[PDB]
């Protein structure tokens, strides 16, 4: 079986400069999760590859960009914080993050936070560069907001600001989770420590001068 996580997303610019509003397209994601055998705090090493594809600012991303991630979360009243650092290389659509729970044991499975913990590092092929909303909003950045519905379980609501602070791309997130089952796959820690490949469907939202996205994450179950 799989634990479905239905993602609804919207992104809006932080600044006032012109942004690219894209035609409908996908970001194709492949991810891999690792454990650092020498890291003794609860943590996740996350490696993502992200590439734009058809349905059928950019100057800041020519090289390797350091990343900082900060998340404050509260799921069924369990409060936690996650802090991470990494590097992204949009030329290859590649990012690497090491993320630590700084408040102790993470109260949810790490895979459920993968999507929350920087689509500006996607590799857009040359024919598609005019559809890269994410880089066009930089350096001032964008707000990424999501609701994530876990089938037969609770939901996450997230709000993140993704923007350059000096030379560093920062992803600062607040996450609130409610209505989770104490016995379920999430609070009961019944998800495999791995990740499947997914396509993120992106469409423009002219009223909010931004984009929206819809996709379904499939978490493998493991006890």
Provide CB contacts within 8 A for 97, sequence distance 6+.
Answer: 44, 45, 46, 47, 48, 67, 69, 84, 85, 86, 117
Buried-exposed string 136-164: b where 16+ CB fall within 10 A, e elsewhere:
bbbbebbbbbbebbbeebbbbebebebbb
Token pair 């978490």 is found at 219
Experimental method: X-ray
Concatenating the DSSP letter of every residue in the chain gives -EEEEEEEEEEEESSSS----PPSEEEEEEEEEE--TT--SSEEEEEEEEEEE----GGGGSS-EEEEEEEEEEETTEEEEEEEEEEEETTTTEEEEEEEETTSS-SS-GGGGTTT--GGG-B--GGGGGG-HHHHTTTT-EEEEEEEEETTS-EEEEEEEEEEETTEEEEEEEEEEES--TTSTTTTT-B-S----EEEEEEEETTTTEEEEEEEEEEEB--
> Which of 129, 186, 176, 127 has its CA nearest to residue 153?
186
Rounded distance between C-alpha atoms, residue 167 and residue 65, angstroms:
7
Compute how many other C-beta atoms are within 10 angstroms of the C-beta atom of residue 89. 16
Provide CB contacts within 8 A for 216, sequence distance 6+.
Answer: 4, 5, 6, 7, 198
**104 with 87: CB under 8 angstroms?**
no
Residue 127: CA atoms inside 13 Å, Cβ hemisphere, count? 3
Using alpha carbons, list the distances in angstroms from residue 89 to 122, 143, 193, 219. Answer: 9, 21, 25, 26
Rg (CA), the chain: 17
> Which of 45, 114, 104 has its CA nearest to residue 80?
104
Q: Which domains does the chain have, with CATH numbers?
A: 2-220 (2.40.155.10)
Q: Please, what is the Cα angle at 37 between 36 and 41, to 5 degrees?
A: 70
> Which of 115, 94, 95, 117 has its CA nearest to residue 43?
117
Compute how many other C-beta atoms are within 10 angstroms of the C-beta atom of residue 54. 12
């Amino acid at each position: 079986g799989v634990q479905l996580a239905d993602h609804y997303q919207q992104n809006t610019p932080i600044g006032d400069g012109p942004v690219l509003l894209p035609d409908n397209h996908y970001l194709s994601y492949q991810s891999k999760l690792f454990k650092d055998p020498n890291e003794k705090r609860d943590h996740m090493v996350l490696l993502e590859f992200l590439t734009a594809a058809g349905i059928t600012g950019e100057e800041l991303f020519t090289g390797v960009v350091p990343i900082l991630v900060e998340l404050d979360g509260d799921v069924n009243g369990h409060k936690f914080s996650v802090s991470g650092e990494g590097e992204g290389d949009a030329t290859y659509g590649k990012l690497t993050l090491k993320l630590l729970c700084t408040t102790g044991k993470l109260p949810v499975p790490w895979p459920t936070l993968v999507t929350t913990l920087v689509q500006c590092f996607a590799r857009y092929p040359d024919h598609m560069k005019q559809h890269d909303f994410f880089k066009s909003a930089m350096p001032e950045g964008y707000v990424q907001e999501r609701t994530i519905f876990f089938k037969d379980d609770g939901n996450y609501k997230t709000r993140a600001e993704v923007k350059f602070e000096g030379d560093t791309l920062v992803n600062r997130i607040e996450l609130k989770g409610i209505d989770f089952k104490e016995d379920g796959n999430i609070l009961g820690h019944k998800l495999e420590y791995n990740y499947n490949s997914h396509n993120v469907y992106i469409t423009a939202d002219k009223q909010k001068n931004g984009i929206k996205a819809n996709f379904k994450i499939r978490h493998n179950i493991e006890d």
